[PDB]
Design a protein around this ligand. Structure first.
Ligand SMILES: *[C@@H]1O[C@H](CO)[C@@H](O[C@@H]2O[C@H](CO)[C@@H](O[C@@H]3O[C@H](CO)[C@@H](O)[C@H](O)[C@@H]3O)[C@H](O)[C@H]2NC(C)=O)[C@H](O)[C@H]1NC(C)=O
Ligand SMILES: *[C@@H]1O[C@H](CO)[C@@H](O[C@@H]2O[C@H](CO)[C@@H](O[C@@H]3O[C@H](CO)[C@@H](O)[C@H](O)[C@@H]3O)[C@H](O)[C@H]2NC(C)=O)[C@H](O)[C@H]1NC(C)=O
Lengths: 49, 49, 262, 52, 52
């Protein structure tokens, strides 16, 4: 049986990040745009979009 | 093939090399959330069992 | 002794439904559940480590649970794990639990808050254990064979297992902004906060004392507690701080080992 | 066989003995995070958080 | 079935039990049990707490 590993997301505030390829079995990586995350105390990443 | 016997294969128990094909696919996170959604075809070994 | 749990803290994650069908961030969020034991014993994983009091000392009564970038403790009693029926807790250490549950289609874990308020979190899980052998018996008899199986053990010695820990991110908080009259106050108490207020010239950086910007309202100022003195966990529901990751290790208790059934 | 910037000391005897965590928690954590790939990481962990 | 009960003044249980075949099925095309953390938003109906 396999076991999927999901590292914690890296939310970048007021900027952008690029995908990096790696030699891992069935590796997958993508970068999304326009996220405005929320946490219990509030919403960080001051930039709205 | 994904979902059936042998989706992931290893040449030996202690061998470092691994071949994995399980149709892992990432999706866009919901607005105002931090969860890293993903989808994946279930294990082929647990089905073969 | 060794006491690895003095560099580790409980964290607040997201729970799908908190026992009432509504969603909110609870300190008892359930991570992955492992059930690779033949006899049918689960290994749930909290987000609030249990068995160690607030002062990092071992204790069979207190459990550590995070509460708004501040750790409290709760009595080990009232820790109830359940499914369609009701489970029996076998072991306990750190984040992990051992249990034996009747068949059901979900499970929740819950324990009282400081104010005797239940904090719960239920995850969808299809549980249907089957005993080893060729009969689907329910409970062991007083006369039978001895068939080998596997189960989780109570020992917490060297196990050769991994959990990744990473430095907690800056937690945003808006309860510290106090707008009095054309000025703001930033609360203190041991939390070195970060700020970024785009009101005039540069007003960014960290601090350990009360400040006033005296220029604009709170609609631009922000606070982010930068607690950087202890590893927390590598969970998908909590963001990351550095682009190449930092990572760490800590063993898990309750390794798998061979026993015999009847 | 652990390394600290330009130290290259053996992991069984870290230079922060004793009470590496109590003297400096952040320094201990960042030292540990730099040796995740080393095979001798666990000895360093055993030595860093052990003091009476 | 279902039953409702609550303690009396003398701390005695007072219950009434009625036969009722309960079997809910969620709106949509899947017979799930607990809402997930990733999904769609299908309209439904429910009772609200207002007393207006
Ligand atoms: C504090 O918060 C302010 C809020 O605005 C942050 O300012 C923002 O900084 C980013 C990065 O420099 C700016 O993005 C830039 O946008 C221009 C287009 O105008 C683009 O050409 C650049 O390549 C870059 O992407 C952003 O525009 C700017 N905000 C505004 C309203 O202009 C500031 O970075 C924050 N500082 C810290 C330390 O968090
Ligand atoms: C329950 O008991 C069974 C049988 O004793 C365990 O399976 C056996 O586990 C041992 C682990 O030392 C295996 O030995 C290995 O053999 C390879 C062969 O080259 C060697 O290179 C390794 O260094 C190691 O010594 C053994 O193959 C394996 N199977 C048998 C004996 O048929 C099982 O692990 C036990 N369950 C546990 C510990 O959870």
């Amino acid at each position: 049986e396999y076991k999927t590993v999901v590292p914690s997301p890296y939310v970048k505030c007021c900027g952008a990040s690029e995908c990096s390829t790696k030699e891992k079995p069935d590796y997958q990586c993508k970068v999304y745009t326009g996220v405005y995350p929320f946490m219990w105390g509030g919403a960080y990443c001051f930039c709205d979009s | 093939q994904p979902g059936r016997f042998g989706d992931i294969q290893s040449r030996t128990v202690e061998s470092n090399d691994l071949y994995a094909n399980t149709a892992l696919k990432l999706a866009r996170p919901s607005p105002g959330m931090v969860h890293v959604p993903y989808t994946q075809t279930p294990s082929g070994f647990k089905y073969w069992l | 002794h060794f006491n690895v749990y003095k560099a580790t803290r409980p964290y607040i994650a997201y729970c799908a439904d908190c026992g009432a069908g509504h969603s909110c961030h609870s300190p008892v969020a359930i991570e992955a559940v492992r059930s690779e034991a033949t006899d049918g014993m689960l290994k749930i994983q909290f987000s609030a480590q249990i068995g160690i009091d607030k002062s990092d000392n071992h204790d069979y009564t207190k459990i550590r649970y995070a509460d708004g970038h501040a750790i409290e403790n709760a009595v080990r009693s009232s820790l109830k794990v359940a499914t369609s029926g009701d489970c029996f807790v076998h072991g306990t250490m750190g984040h992990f639990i051992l249990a034996k549950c009747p068949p059901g289609e979900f499970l929740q874990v819950s324990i009282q808050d400081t104010r005797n308020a239940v904090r719960a979190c239920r995850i969808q899980y299809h549980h249907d254990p089957q005993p080893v052998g060729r009969e689907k018996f329910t409970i062991r008899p007083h006369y039978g064979k001895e068939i080998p199986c596997t189960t989780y053990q109570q020992t917490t010695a060297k196990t050769v297992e991994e959990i990744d820990m990473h430095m907690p991110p800056d937690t945003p908080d808006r309860t510290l902004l106090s707008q009095q009259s054309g000025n703001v106050k930033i609360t203190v108490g041991g939390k070195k906060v970060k700020y970024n207020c785009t009101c005039g010239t540069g007003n960014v950086g960290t601090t350990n004392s009360d400040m006033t910007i005296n220029t604009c309202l709170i609609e631009q100022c922000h606070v982010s507690v930068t607690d950087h003195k202890k590893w927390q966990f590598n969970s998908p529901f909590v963001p990351r701080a550095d682009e190449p990751a930092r990572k760490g290790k800590v063993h898990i208790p309750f390794p798998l080992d061979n026993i015999t059934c009847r | 066989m652990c390394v600290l910037a330009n130290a290259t000391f053996p992991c069984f005897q870290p230079p922060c003995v004793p009470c590496c965590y109590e003297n400096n928690a952040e320094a201990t954590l960042r030292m540990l995070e730099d040796n995740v790939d080393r095979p001798g990481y666990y000895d360093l962990l055993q030595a860093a958080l052990t003091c009476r």
